[model samples]
Target: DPEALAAEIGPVKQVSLGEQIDAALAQQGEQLFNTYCTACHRLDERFIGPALRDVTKRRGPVYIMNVMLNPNGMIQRHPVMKQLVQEYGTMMTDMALSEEQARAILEYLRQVAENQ
Candidate 1:
């Protein structure tokens, strides 16, 4: 049921990450996330955007990348994203980041995701 919730994969078709965390990339991710995502997203609590620290627990890597790469398109065309926009009272912005950049952010999110 969780897999079927909302959106198309967008540009990120497939993704595979190692069990081992990549600290270098994750550090890069932390910087990027702090710069771009911190404006709206909070790591622990739901803010202007949804909380992201535990995001990977509920969202897959490809799904996360799609939103990072093209949030506006997802907001318009993706059902769940649109629903979230309505719930949040705003649509997210597009960072237009490269695939690797988004991957780094995803990696950062994964590293910090708290297992509930």
Candidate 2:
């Protein structure tokens, strides 16, 4: 069942370069989370993956947002992401979010990380 879960959870897409660096996209990212991610992922707790409060501190905004937008590719290419997949066993879907949205999420994450 673990293998099935892993397969079910693999990242399914790739994040674009532009969306990886925008500052105004965090709000949309937050909305995206409320609609989709909130079902499992959480800001301060390990709902499905790791706690995202200090995620930016642990990794770059571009890296985090890219992982959000394109987790499958990141898991395949990034060593740390691979390790995370091994642990979380949940794939991140594309959610059809744009680059500006991802950027806003990064900014929101930064704000949360600062407080935590």
Candidate 3:
């Protein structure tokens, strides 16, 4: 589960989203996440998707980005996502987010995790 989740996804490479919390980017990410992700995932607890408060800790930034960028592929190929679908009975829908957008959201997640 952990291994598959950590694996890279195609040409969608990882960026150095270091420890510095870009507040501006994270704010933008929050807006986008509220619009696109609030229906499913929550920061503190589960809804249609799992709690994501510490996703950056549980998953790598690349993994999170890959999942956001390629939900269908992740669901189809990732064992963890398949298991999540089995448990939640709801497959993750593709958000059609750009790599930039995904990175912003990842920054937001990093902030959330750091604040924890």
> Model 3 over residues 49-76: C-alpha lDDT tens digits?
9999988888766678888888888788
lDDT for predicted candidate 2 compared with the true structure:
0.64
Local accuracy of candidate 1 as per-residue lDDT tens digits, 1-116? 32333334477677778878788998999999998899999888998988888888877666688888888766776776787988999768877689988889888898887333
Candidate 2, 79-109: lDDT as tens digits: 7778888898886666776666665666677
List the candidate 1 regions with Cα displacement exceeding 4 Å. Answer: 1-9, 114-116
TM-score, candidate 2, is 0.70
TM-score for all models, in order of appearance: 0.87, 0.70, 0.89
Worst 10 residues of 2 by lDDT: 6-15
Q: Evaluated with TM-score, which candidate comes out highest? A: 3
TM-score rank order = 3, 1, 2
Error of 2 at 28 (Å): 5.1
* Residue 25 error, candidate 1, Å: 0.8
Q: Output the number of the lDDT-best candidate.
A: 3
